UniProtKB/Swiss-Prot annotation, chains A, B:
Residues 11-46, 47-82 form the EF-hand domain. The keyword Metal-binding applies. Its main location: nucleus. Disulfide bonds: none annotated. This is Protein S100-A6. It comes from the Eukaryota. Ca(2+) 2 binds at D60, N62, D64, E66, E71. GO terms for biological process: axonogenesis; positive regulation of fibroblast proliferation; signal transduction. It comes from Homo sapiens (Human). Pfam families: S_100.
Length: 89, 89
């Protein structure tokens, strides 16, 4: 319940909010991932369909069409680095 | 200001809350990192001095005694994976 735990908890809750909708409840399908990106991230709302499709491919490291929690965490890490760098310039 | 952005923002704010105290304002010294671990994470409060010292070494990937944002993000990723796995069992 400490500050960092709560932040991490939010990240985890958002993943499952979308991953549990269809197919494997533990992975994000293209549809689930696109919705998560568009509704949960500011940059997601700025991206156009073509850009999102390519971004999702890059996130799908093992190219199995699904984004598991590990792949999602990698995405979060990248977003955090971008965030830190921006708030730095 | 969207949900995932806020979670990421919290992660970033916590880093700087401690990193800006001494030396390089952009990196966490051993002292700053130990305080962050002990006060911002539940598991941090459970760890004893010896365990924390070793954990900090592992987080310091390039072994320069400081933990930069990138190294901190790696730590966060690991914590997120642990969190997800625990809330799964
Ligand atoms: Ca799913
Ligand atoms: Ca995958
Ligand atoms: Ca510092
Ligand atoms: Ca380092």
């Amino acid at each position: 319940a400490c500050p960092l735990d709560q932040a991490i908890g939010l990240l985890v809750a958002i993943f499952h909010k979308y991953s549990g909708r269809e197919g494997d409840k533990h992975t994000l399908s293209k549809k689930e991932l696109k919705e998560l990106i568009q509704k949960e991230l500011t940059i997601g709302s700025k991206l156009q369909d073509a850009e999102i499709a390519r971004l999702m491919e890059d996130l799908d490291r093992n190219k199995d069409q699904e984004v598991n929690f590990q792949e999602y965490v990698t995405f979060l890490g990248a977003l955090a680095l971008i965030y830190n760098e921006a708030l730095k310039g």
